[PDB]
Protein backbone atom coordinates (compact mmCIF):
# COMPACT_ATOMS: atom_id res chain seq x y z
CA UNK A 14 0.00 0.00 0.00
CA UNK A 15 1.20 3.49 -0.85
CA UNK A 16 -0.08 7.01 -0.20
CA UNK A 17 0.22 8.72 -3.58
CA UNK A 18 -1.40 12.04 -2.77
CA UNK A 19 -2.42 13.95 0.34
CA UNK A 20 -3.74 17.51 0.76
CA UNK A 21 -5.82 19.53 3.20
CA UNK A 22 -9.51 18.60 2.90
CA UNK A 23 -10.71 22.19 2.49
CA UNK A 24 -8.78 22.55 -0.78
CA UNK A 25 -11.11 19.99 -2.36
CA UNK A 26 -14.30 21.18 -0.72
CA UNK A 27 -14.47 18.41 1.86
CA UNK A 28 -15.51 19.40 5.37
CA UNK A 29 -13.33 18.30 8.28
CA UNK A 30 -14.40 14.94 9.72
CA UNK A 31 -15.06 15.44 13.44
CA UNK A 32 -13.73 12.17 14.85
CA UNK A 33 -13.64 11.84 18.67
CA UNK A 34 -10.86 13.19 20.87
CA UNK A 35 -10.91 11.23 24.12
CA UNK A 36 -10.97 7.43 24.24
CA UNK A 37 -14.22 5.71 25.24
CA UNK A 38 -12.17 3.27 27.32
CA UNK A 39 -12.12 4.03 31.05
CA UNK A 40 -10.85 2.03 34.05
CA UNK A 41 -13.51 -0.49 35.11
CA UNK A 42 -14.33 -1.44 38.71
CA UNK A 43 -11.98 -4.40 38.20
CA UNK A 44 -8.97 -2.25 37.21
CA UNK A 45 -7.27 -2.60 40.60
CA UNK A 46 -8.28 -6.22 41.25
CA UNK A 47 -6.53 -7.66 38.18
CA UNK A 48 -3.06 -6.88 36.80
CA UNK A 49 -2.43 -5.54 33.30
CA UNK A 50 -0.14 -3.46 31.10
CA UNK A 51 -2.30 -2.40 28.17
CA UNK A 52 -3.87 1.01 27.82
CA UNK A 53 -6.13 2.79 25.32
CA UNK A 54 -4.40 3.43 21.99
CA UNK A 55 -3.29 6.99 21.27
CA UNK A 56 -6.04 8.90 19.48
CA UNK A 57 -4.61 12.42 19.20
CA UNK A 58 -1.30 14.15 18.37
CA UNK A 59 -0.84 15.72 21.77
CA UNK A 60 -1.13 12.51 23.81
CA UNK A 61 1.28 12.91 26.80
CA UNK A 62 2.19 9.23 26.48
CA UNK A 63 3.62 9.61 22.98
CA UNK A 64 7.32 9.03 22.37
CA UNK A 65 7.13 9.45 18.60
CA UNK A 66 5.30 11.49 15.98
CA UNK A 67 1.69 10.27 15.90
CA UNK A 68 0.63 11.39 12.40
CA UNK A 69 3.76 9.76 11.03
CA UNK A 70 3.33 6.63 13.11
CA UNK A 71 -0.23 5.82 12.08
CA UNK A 72 0.54 5.98 8.36
CA UNK A 73 3.81 4.08 8.50
CA UNK A 74 2.07 0.79 7.66
CA UNK A 75 1.96 1.98 4.04
CA UNK A 76 5.44 0.69 3.32
CA UNK A 77 5.03 0.94 -0.45
CA UNK A 78 4.33 -1.41 -3.34
CA UNK A 79 6.47 -4.00 -5.10
CA UNK A 80 5.38 -3.23 -8.63
CA UNK A 81 5.21 -6.45 -10.62
CA UNK A 82 2.85 -8.41 -12.82
CA UNK A 83 1.18 -11.68 -11.83
CA UNK A 84 4.01 -14.20 -12.22
CA UNK A 85 3.87 -17.94 -12.89
CA UNK A 86 3.78 -18.81 -9.20
CA UNK A 87 0.76 -16.61 -8.51
CA UNK A 88 -1.02 -18.14 -11.49
CA UNK A 89 -0.62 -21.68 -10.26
CA UNK A 90 -1.60 -20.61 -6.73
CA UNK A 91 -4.81 -18.96 -7.98
CA UNK A 92 -5.58 -22.03 -10.08
CA UNK A 93 -5.19 -24.45 -7.19
CA UNK A 94 -7.12 -22.28 -4.75
CA UNK A 95 -9.84 -21.62 -7.33
CA UNK A 96 -10.06 -25.37 -7.74
CA UNK A 97 -10.93 -25.73 -4.06
CA UNK A 98 -13.57 -23.00 -4.06
CA UNK A 99 -15.36 -24.39 -7.14
CA UNK A 100 -16.37 -27.31 -4.95
CA UNK A 101 -18.48 -24.93 -2.85
CA UNK A 102 -20.67 -23.83 -5.78
CA UNK A 103 -20.61 -20.15 -4.87
CA UNK A 104 -23.46 -18.19 -6.44
CA UNK A 105 -22.24 -15.12 -8.31
CA UNK A 106 -25.82 -13.89 -8.52
CA UNK A 107 -26.48 -10.62 -6.68
CA UNK A 108 -28.10 -11.06 -3.27
CA UNK A 109 -31.48 -9.37 -3.01
CA UNK A 110 -31.32 -6.08 -1.13
CA UNK A 111 -33.46 -7.11 1.85
CA UNK A 112 -31.22 -10.10 2.53
CA UNK A 113 -28.01 -8.10 2.02
CA UNK A 114 -29.20 -5.36 4.36
CA UNK A 115 -31.38 -6.83 7.07
CA UNK A 116 -29.99 -10.31 7.56
CA UNK A 117 -30.19 -13.88 6.32
CA UNK A 118 -28.45 -17.10 7.32
CA UNK A 119 -24.73 -16.77 6.72
CA UNK A 120 -24.82 -12.98 6.66
CA UNK A 121 -25.70 -10.89 9.71
CA UNK A 122 -27.68 -7.73 9.04
CA UNK A 123 -25.76 -4.53 8.32
CA UNK A 124 -24.44 -3.07 11.60
CA UNK A 125 -26.71 -0.13 12.42
CA UNK A 126 -24.26 0.99 15.08
CA UNK A 127 -21.24 1.78 12.94
CA UNK A 128 -20.52 4.87 10.82
CA UNK A 129 -22.56 5.48 7.66
CA UNK A 130 -19.45 6.97 6.13
CA UNK A 131 -19.38 9.85 3.65
CA UNK A 132 -21.30 12.00 3.00
CA UNK A 133 -23.84 11.10 5.71
CA UNK A 134 -21.26 11.65 8.45
CA UNK A 135 -20.92 15.25 7.26
CA UNK A 136 -24.70 15.71 7.02
CA UNK A 137 -25.27 14.38 10.52
CA UNK A 138 -27.23 11.48 9.01
CA UNK A 139 -26.98 8.15 10.85
CA UNK A 140 -27.67 4.62 9.62
CA UNK A 141 -30.74 4.43 11.82
CA UNK A 142 -32.06 7.58 10.11
CA UNK A 143 -32.15 5.51 6.91
CA UNK A 144 -32.71 1.94 8.06
CA UNK A 145 -35.07 0.39 10.58
CA UNK A 146 -34.78 -3.17 11.82
CA UNK A 147 -38.46 -3.60 12.72
CA UNK A 148 -39.64 -2.17 9.38
CA UNK A 149 -36.98 -3.47 6.98
CA UNK A 150 -37.68 -0.38 4.90
CA UNK A 151 -35.58 0.10 1.76
CA UNK A 152 -37.26 3.20 0.33
CA UNK A 153 -34.96 5.72 1.97
CA UNK A 154 -31.96 3.51 1.22
CA UNK A 155 -32.81 3.34 -2.49
CA UNK A 156 -33.33 7.08 -2.24
CA UNK A 157 -29.86 7.69 -0.80
CA UNK A 158 -28.07 5.28 -3.11
CA UNK A 159 -29.57 6.81 -6.25
CA UNK A 160 -28.80 10.29 -4.94
CA UNK A 161 -25.14 9.90 -4.01
CA UNK A 162 -24.22 6.82 -6.01
CA UNK A 163 -21.23 4.53 -5.47
CA UNK A 164 -17.45 4.91 -5.23
CA UNK A 165 -17.52 7.50 -2.49
CA UNK A 166 -14.57 8.39 -0.23
CA UNK A 167 -13.91 6.19 2.81
CA UNK A 168 -13.71 7.79 6.24
CA UNK A 169 -10.56 6.85 8.15
CA UNK A 170 -10.73 6.57 11.95
CA UNK A 171 -8.23 5.57 14.61
CA UNK A 172 -9.28 2.30 16.26
CA UNK A 173 -10.16 2.94 19.92
CA UNK A 174 -8.74 -0.22 21.52
CA UNK A 175 -6.28 -1.41 24.18
CA UNK A 176 -2.62 -1.66 23.18
CA UNK A 177 0.71 -2.61 24.73
CA UNK A 178 3.02 -0.06 26.35
CA UNK A 179 5.27 -0.14 23.28
CA UNK A 180 2.48 0.46 20.75
CA UNK A 181 1.12 3.34 22.81
CA UNK A 182 4.55 4.95 23.14
CA UNK A 183 5.30 4.53 19.45
CA UNK A 184 1.82 5.81 18.62
CA UNK A 185 1.17 2.78 16.44
CA UNK A 186 -2.62 2.97 16.61
CA UNK A 187 -4.60 1.06 13.98
CA UNK A 188 -6.57 2.84 11.26
CA UNK A 189 -9.94 1.49 10.17
CA UNK A 190 -11.98 2.63 7.19
CA UNK A 191 -15.68 3.32 7.16
CA UNK A 192 -17.05 2.65 3.70
CA UNK A 193 -20.07 4.73 2.67
CA UNK A 194 -23.38 3.05 3.40
CA UNK A 195 -24.00 3.11 -0.36
CA UNK A 196 -20.82 1.14 -1.05
CA UNK A 197 -21.28 -1.31 1.84
CA UNK A 198 -24.71 -2.21 0.49
CA UNK A 199 -23.64 -2.39 -3.15
CA UNK A 200 -20.81 -4.75 -2.15
CA UNK A 201 -23.01 -6.86 0.10
CA UNK A 202 -25.29 -7.30 -2.92
CA UNK A 203 -22.42 -8.18 -5.22
CA UNK A 204 -20.60 -10.57 -2.90
CA UNK A 205 -23.33 -11.45 -0.42
CA UNK A 206 -23.50 -15.09 -1.49
CA UNK A 207 -19.73 -15.44 -1.31
CA UNK A 208 -19.77 -13.99 2.22
CA UNK A 209 -22.56 -16.38 3.16
CA UNK A 210 -20.77 -19.46 1.80
CA UNK A 211 -17.55 -18.52 3.59
CA UNK A 212 -19.35 -17.85 6.86
CA UNK A 213 -21.13 -21.21 6.64
CA UNK A 214 -18.00 -23.11 5.67
CA UNK A 215 -15.00 -22.24 7.83
CA UNK A 216 -12.19 -24.73 7.22
CA UNK A 217 -9.68 -26.00 4.66
CA UNK A 218 -11.88 -25.83 1.58
CA UNK A 219 -12.63 -22.10 1.96
CA UNK A 220 -9.29 -21.80 3.73
CA UNK A 221 -11.12 -19.34 5.98
CA UNK A 222 -12.06 -19.12 9.67
CA UNK A 223 -14.03 -15.87 9.38
CA UNK A 224 -17.27 -16.27 11.29
CA UNK A 225 -16.24 -19.48 13.05
CA UNK A 226 -17.06 -20.26 16.66
CA UNK A 227 -13.87 -21.34 18.50
CA UNK A 228 -15.90 -23.46 20.94
CA UNK A 229 -16.89 -25.75 18.09
CA UNK A 230 -14.29 -25.13 15.37
CA UNK A 231 -11.19 -25.85 17.47
CA UNK A 232 -11.98 -29.59 17.62
CA UNK A 233 -12.14 -29.74 13.83
CA UNK A 234 -8.88 -27.90 13.19
CA UNK A 235 -6.51 -30.73 14.18
CA UNK A 236 -8.55 -33.18 12.09
CA UNK A 237 -8.22 -30.82 9.10
CA UNK A 238 -4.56 -29.93 9.67
CA UNK A 239 -3.13 -33.41 9.30
CA UNK A 240 0.66 -33.07 9.13
CA UNK A 241 3.50 -30.81 10.24
CA UNK A 242 2.18 -27.42 11.33
CA UNK A 243 3.16 -24.19 9.60
CA UNK A 244 2.42 -20.89 11.37
CA UNK A 245 3.82 -17.37 11.25
CA UNK A 246 2.74 -13.76 11.54
CA UNK A 247 2.64 -10.61 9.47
CA UNK A 248 3.59 -7.05 10.36
CA UNK A 249 1.12 -4.62 8.84
CA UNK A 250 -0.35 -7.26 6.52
CA UNK A 251 -3.26 -5.11 5.30
CA UNK A 252 -1.28 -2.02 4.39
CA UNK A 253 1.56 -4.08 2.89
CA UNK A 254 -0.57 -5.70 0.19
CA UNK A 255 0.58 -4.53 -3.24
CA UNK A 256 -1.74 -4.00 -6.22
CA UNK A 257 -0.49 -7.31 -7.68
CA UNK A 258 -2.27 -9.37 -5.00
CA UNK A 259 -5.54 -7.59 -5.78
CA UNK A 260 -4.98 -8.49 -9.42
CA UNK A 261 -4.69 -12.11 -8.26
CA UNK A 262 -7.88 -11.80 -6.23
CA UNK A 263 -9.70 -10.50 -9.30
CA UNK A 264 -8.49 -13.43 -11.39
CA UNK A 265 -9.72 -15.89 -8.80
CA UNK A 266 -13.04 -14.07 -8.44
CA UNK A 267 -13.39 -14.26 -12.23
CA UNK A 268 -12.65 -17.99 -12.28
CA UNK A 269 -15.55 -18.28 -9.83
CA UNK A 270 -17.97 -16.74 -12.29
CA UNK A 271 -17.90 -13.06 -11.42
CA UNK A 272 -17.76 -10.66 -14.35
CA UNK A 273 -15.08 -8.01 -14.91
CA UNK A 274 -17.76 -5.49 -14.00
CA UNK A 275 -18.51 -7.11 -10.65
CA UNK A 276 -14.82 -7.37 -9.73
CA UNK A 277 -14.47 -3.63 -10.26
CA UNK A 278 -15.32 -3.27 -6.59
CA UNK A 279 -11.98 -4.90 -5.83
CA UNK A 280 -10.48 -1.83 -7.57
CA UNK A 281 -12.50 0.27 -5.13
CA UNK A 282 -10.69 -1.46 -2.26
CA UNK A 283 -7.23 -1.31 -3.82
CA UNK A 284 -7.13 2.27 -5.12
CA UNK A 285 -8.91 4.12 -2.36
CA UNK A 286 -9.83 7.73 -1.60
CA UNK A 287 -9.78 8.62 2.12
CA UNK A 288 -11.00 11.38 4.41
CA UNK A 289 -9.03 11.57 7.65
CA UNK A 290 -10.07 14.43 9.92
CA UNK A 291 -8.87 17.55 8.06
CA UNK A 292 -6.90 15.65 5.43
CA UNK A 293 -7.97 13.74 2.35
CA UNK A 294 -5.73 11.33 0.43
CA UNK A 295 -5.38 8.64 -2.22
CA UNK A 296 -3.82 5.23 -1.67
CA UNK A 297 -2.60 2.66 -4.15
CA UNK A 298 -2.62 -0.88 -2.79
CA UNK A 299 -3.41 -1.99 0.77
CA UNK A 300 -6.62 -3.59 2.08
CA UNK A 301 -8.82 -0.89 3.68
CA UNK A 302 -9.78 -2.70 6.91
CA UNK A 303 -13.36 -1.91 7.82
CA UNK A 304 -14.90 -1.89 4.35
CA UNK A 305 -17.28 -4.66 3.34
CA UNK A 306 -15.71 -8.11 3.19
CA UNK A 307 -12.13 -7.07 4.01
CA UNK A 308 -11.69 -9.98 6.43
CA UNK A 309 -12.83 -12.48 3.82
CA UNK A 310 -10.79 -10.85 1.08
CA UNK A 311 -7.68 -10.70 3.29
CA UNK A 312 -8.14 -14.41 3.92
CA UNK A 313 -8.60 -15.27 0.24
CA UNK A 314 -5.52 -13.26 -0.71
CA UNK A 315 -3.55 -15.00 2.07
CA UNK A 316 -4.50 -18.38 0.57
CA UNK A 317 -3.01 -17.18 -2.73
CA UNK A 318 0.10 -15.72 -1.10
CA UNK A 319 1.16 -18.78 0.92
CA UNK A 320 0.56 -21.11 -2.01
CA UNK A 321 2.60 -18.70 -4.14
CA UNK A 322 5.52 -18.67 -1.70
CA UNK A 323 5.44 -22.44 -1.38
CA UNK A 324 5.63 -22.88 -5.16
CA UNK A 325 8.46 -20.38 -5.51
CA UNK A 326 10.67 -21.80 -2.77
CA UNK A 327 9.68 -25.46 -2.99
CA UNK A 328 9.40 -26.17 -6.70
CA UNK A 329 8.07 -29.70 -6.63
CA UNK A 330 5.70 -29.04 -3.74
CA UNK A 331 2.35 -30.81 -3.98
CA UNK A 332 -0.35 -28.32 -2.98
CA UNK A 333 -2.93 -31.12 -3.01
CA UNK A 334 -1.42 -32.21 0.30
CA UNK A 335 -1.23 -28.64 1.58
CA UNK A 336 -3.84 -27.42 4.07
CA UNK A 337 -4.44 -23.94 5.43
CA UNK A 338 -6.97 -21.82 7.29
CA UNK A 339 -6.76 -18.05 7.47
CA UNK A 340 -8.56 -15.32 9.36
CA UNK A 341 -7.28 -12.22 7.63
CA UNK A 342 -3.53 -12.22 8.25
CA UNK A 343 -3.63 -15.00 10.88
CA UNK A 344 -2.57 -18.34 9.36
CA UNK A 345 -2.30 -21.93 10.51
CA UNK A 346 -1.49 -24.67 8.02
CA UNK A 347 0.09 -28.06 7.50
CA UNK A 348 2.02 -30.08 4.95
CA UNK A 349 3.09 -33.76 5.27
CA UNK A 350 6.77 -32.74 5.21
CA UNK A 351 8.74 -30.15 7.19
CA UNK A 352 8.77 -26.68 5.65
CA UNK A 353 11.19 -23.88 6.46
CA UNK A 354 8.96 -20.90 7.25
CA UNK A 355 12.03 -18.65 7.26
CA UNK A 356 12.54 -19.42 3.58
CA UNK A 357 8.92 -18.57 2.81
CA UNK A 358 9.31 -15.36 4.83
CA UNK A 359 12.29 -14.21 2.76
CA UNK A 360 10.41 -15.03 -0.45
CA UNK A 361 7.58 -12.94 0.95
CA UNK A 362 9.87 -9.96 1.54
CA UNK A 363 10.43 -10.08 -2.20
CA UNK A 364 6.70 -9.57 -2.68
CA UNK A 365 6.51 -6.67 -0.24
CA UNK A 366 5.38 -8.75 2.72
CA UNK A 367 6.72 -8.70 6.27
CA UNK A 368 6.44 -12.19 7.76
CA UNK A 369 7.76 -13.04 11.23
CA UNK A 370 7.96 -16.00 13.65
CA UNK A 371 4.61 -17.03 15.14
CA UNK A 372 3.81 -15.09 18.34
CA UNK A 373 6.85 -12.80 18.12
CA UNK A 374 9.20 -15.73 18.63
CA UNK A 375 12.97 -15.53 18.30
CA UNK A 376 13.10 -17.83 15.29
CA UNK A 377 10.83 -19.76 12.96
CA UNK A 378 11.14 -22.50 15.56
CA UNK A 379 9.27 -25.78 15.58
CA UNK A 380 5.56 -25.03 15.69
CA UNK A 381 3.70 -27.59 17.81
CA UNK A 382 0.13 -28.27 18.87
CA UNK A 383 1.35 -27.12 22.28
CA UNK A 384 2.73 -23.71 21.32
CA UNK A 385 0.66 -22.85 18.27
CA UNK A 386 -2.02 -20.17 18.52
CA UNK A 387 -4.80 -19.01 16.22
CA UNK A 388 -7.07 -16.03 16.89
CA UNK A 389 -4.85 -15.64 19.97
CA UNK A 390 -6.07 -18.96 21.37
CA UNK A 391 -4.01 -22.07 22.16
CA UNK A 392 -5.13 -25.64 21.56
CA UNK A 393 -5.65 -28.05 24.46
CA UNK A 394 -7.35 -31.41 24.08
CA UNK A 395 -9.85 -32.14 26.84
CA UNK A 396 -8.41 -34.48 29.47
CA UNK A 397 -11.51 -36.70 29.49
CA UNK A 398 -12.66 -36.39 25.86
CA UNK A 399 -9.42 -36.39 23.78
CA UNK A 400 -11.22 -35.77 20.47
CA UNK A 401 -12.64 -32.51 21.85
CA UNK A 402 -10.30 -29.50 21.83
CA UNK A 403 -10.37 -26.45 24.07
CA UNK A 404 -9.77 -23.00 22.53
CA UNK A 405 -7.55 -21.47 25.24
CA UNK A 406 -7.49 -17.69 25.47
CA UNK A 407 -4.61 -16.69 27.78
CA UNK A 408 -5.84 -15.51 31.19
CA UNK A 409 -3.46 -12.58 30.68
CA UNK A 410 -5.57 -11.28 27.80
CA UNK A 411 -8.77 -11.80 29.77
CA UNK A 412 -7.23 -9.82 32.63
CA UNK A 413 -6.25 -6.99 30.27
CA UNK A 414 -9.76 -6.77 28.88
CA UNK A 415 -11.68 -6.83 32.16
CA UNK A 416 -9.76 -3.84 33.55
CA UNK A 417 -11.40 -1.44 31.10
CA UNK A 418 -14.81 -0.73 29.63
CA UNK A 419 -16.34 1.55 27.05
CA UNK A 420 -19.76 1.37 28.69
CA UNK A 421 -20.28 0.26 32.36
CA UNK A 422 -23.92 -0.48 31.55
CA UNK A 423 -22.70 -3.59 29.73
CA UNK A 424 -20.77 -5.11 32.64
CA UNK A 425 -23.06 -8.15 32.87
CA UNK A 426 -22.59 -8.94 29.17
CA UNK A 427 -18.88 -8.09 29.15
CA UNK A 428 -18.00 -10.24 32.16
CA UNK A 429 -20.15 -13.16 31.01
CA UNK A 430 -18.36 -13.02 27.64
CA UNK A 431 -15.02 -13.22 29.41
CA UNK A 432 -16.29 -16.10 31.52
CA UNK A 433 -17.12 -18.02 28.32
CA UNK A 434 -13.44 -17.65 27.36
CA UNK A 435 -11.84 -18.16 30.78
CA UNK A 436 -13.15 -21.56 31.88
CA UNK A 437 -11.26 -23.28 29.06
CA UNK A 438 -8.18 -22.48 31.17
CA UNK A 439 -9.30 -24.99 33.77
CA UNK A 440 -11.37 -25.10 36.95
CA UNK A 441 -8.73 -23.80 39.35
CA UNK A 442 -7.99 -20.86 37.05
CA UNK A 443 -11.72 -20.25 36.61
CA UNK A 444 -12.41 -20.25 40.33
CA UNK A 445 -9.69 -17.68 40.97
CA UNK A 446 -11.04 -15.47 38.17
CA UNK A 447 -14.50 -15.69 39.76
CA UNK A 448 -13.17 -15.10 43.28
CA UNK A 449 -11.45 -11.88 42.26
CA UNK A 450 -14.48 -10.72 40.31
CA UNK A 451 -16.54 -11.24 43.45
CA UNK A 452 -14.01 -9.32 45.54
CA UNK A 453 -15.71 -6.19 44.16
CA UNK A 454 -19.35 -5.39 44.99
CA UNK A 455 -20.43 -5.26 41.33
CA UNK A 456 -19.05 -8.77 40.98
CA UNK A 457 -21.58 -10.20 43.44
CA UNK A 458 -24.39 -8.52 41.51
CA UNK A 459 -23.60 -10.35 38.31
CA UNK A 460 -25.11 -13.60 37.17
CA UNK A 461 -21.95 -15.62 36.52
CA UNK A 462 -22.12 -19.15 35.06
CA UNK A 463 -20.74 -22.00 37.15
CA UNK A 464 -17.83 -24.02 35.77
CA UNK A 465 -19.75 -27.32 35.73
CA UNK A 466 -22.47 -25.60 33.69
CA UNK A 467 -20.04 -24.18 31.16
CA UNK A 468 -18.42 -27.61 30.77
CA UNK A 469 -21.75 -29.40 30.47
CA UNK A 470 -23.11 -27.07 27.79
CA UNK A 471 -19.82 -27.23 25.92
CA UNK A 472 -19.84 -31.04 25.87
CA UNK A 473 -23.50 -31.05 24.83
CA UNK A 474 -22.91 -28.58 22.00
CA UNK A 475 -21.25 -31.36 19.98
Ligand code: NA
Pocket residue numbers: 046047048412
Ligand atom coordinates in the same frame (compact mmCIF):
# COMPACT_ATOMS: atom_id res chain seq x y z
NA1 NA B 1 -4.37 -10.80 37.83
Ligand code: NA
Pocket residue numbers: 015078297
Ligand atom coordinates in the same frame (compact mmCIF):
# COMPACT_ATOMS: atom_id res chain seq x y z
NA1 NA C 1 3.55 2.96 -6.48
Ligand code: NA
Pocket residue numbers: 083084085086
Ligand atom coordinates in the same frame (compact mmCIF):
# COMPACT_ATOMS: atom_id res chain seq x y z
NA1 NA D 1 6.65 -15.16 -14.73
Ligand code: NA
Pocket residue numbers: 241242243379380381
Ligand atom coordinates in the same frame (compact mmCIF):
# COMPACT_ATOMS: atom_id res chain seq x y z
NA1 NA E 1 5.88 -28.05 12.73
Ligand code: NA
Pocket residue numbers: 201304305306
Ligand atom coordinates in the same frame (compact mmCIF):
# COMPACT_ATOMS: atom_id res chain seq x y z
NA1 NA F 1 -19.67 -7.04 5.02
Ligand code: NA
Pocket residue numbers: 223224306308309
Ligand atom coordinates in the same frame (compact mmCIF):
# COMPACT_ATOMS: atom_id res chain seq x y z
NA1 NA G 1 -17.25 -11.13 7.93
Ligand code: NA
Pocket residue numbers: 326327328329330
Ligand atom coordinates in the same frame (compact mmCIF):
# COMPACT_ATOMS: atom_id res chain seq x y z
NA1 NA H 1 11.55 -28.63 -3.73
Ligand code: NA
Pocket residue numbers: 397
Ligand atom coordinates in the same frame (compact mmCIF):
# COMPACT_ATOMS: atom_id res chain seq x y z
NA1 NA I 1 -18.24 -36.06 32.35
Ligand code: NA
Pocket residue numbers: 175410411413414
Ligand atom coordinates in the same frame (compact mmCIF):
# COMPACT_ATOMS: atom_id res chain seq x y z
NA1 NA J 1 -6.32 -8.03 24.99
